Amino acid sequence: HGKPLTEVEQKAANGVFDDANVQNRTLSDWDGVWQSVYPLLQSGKLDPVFQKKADADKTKTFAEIKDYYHKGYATDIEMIGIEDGIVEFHRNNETTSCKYDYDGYKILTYKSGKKGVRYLFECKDPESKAPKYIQFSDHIIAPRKSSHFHIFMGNDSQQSLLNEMENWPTYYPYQLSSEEVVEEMMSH
Ligand SMILES: [Zn+2]
């Protein structure tokens, strides 16, 4: 399940790192078949996660937490498959795909002061119907296989996506059982 993170990596994941620490990554870091976690939230299976967080965070109610993740996870792209430079999106019973080109990364500084890195990709295949712009965010700032990721998709501009803060379709390995998904969110 991937090597334990170093102190640096753990800090980075927690939004603490300096620009010089950030490095470029390849689309292969996200290779695999991924499932959207939105269904688990709609089914109530993620409730134990929000229950735990609410008991731990006296300033947040269960509803506030679940609502945060509700806005965050919402999506109709149930599955995402990534292989050999091609990202494919499954919305309902229809698929779109593009051989995305890497456009680099962007380091964002959040209103709370914490930081995070977005890895940008762009679709330049005119026949494609997939999103023109996409961004991966997974609490990682240097080459390493992702364990789960948040993806931003759009057709206007990369800046537009950088402006997004509430919706972020989240994906975990398709092979991962639902019980393991809950464990990972609660255990980290
Ligand atoms: Zn995350």
UniProtKB/Swiss-Prot annotation:
InterPro entries: Calycin, ZinT_dom. Its main location: cytoplasm. Disulfide bonds: none annotated. NCBIfam families: PRK10306.1 (NF007639). It is found in: Cytoplasm; Periplasm. GO terms for biological process: cellular response to cadmium ion; cellular response to hydrogen peroxide; cellular response to zinc ion starvation; intracellular zinc ion homeostasis. One of its GO terms (molecular function) is zinc ion binding. Transmembrane segments: none annotated. Pfam families: ZinT (PF09223). May function as a periplasmic zinc chaperone or mediate direct transport of zinc from the periplasm to the cytoplasm under zinc-limited conditions. Binds zinc with high affinity, and can also bind cadmium, mercury or nickel. Preferentially binds Zn(2+) over Cd(2+). Contains one high affinity metal binding site, and can bind additional metal ions at other sites. It comes from the Bacteria. Zn(2+) 2 binds at H148, E184, H188. Zn(2+) 1 binds at H139, H148, H150. Disruption phenotype: Mutant shows a growth defect and a lowered cellular Zn(2+) level under Zn(2+) limitation. Mutant does not bind cadmium. This is Metal-binding protein ZinT. Belongs to the calycin superfamily. ZinT family. One of its GO terms (cellular component) is outer membrane-bounded periplasmic space.
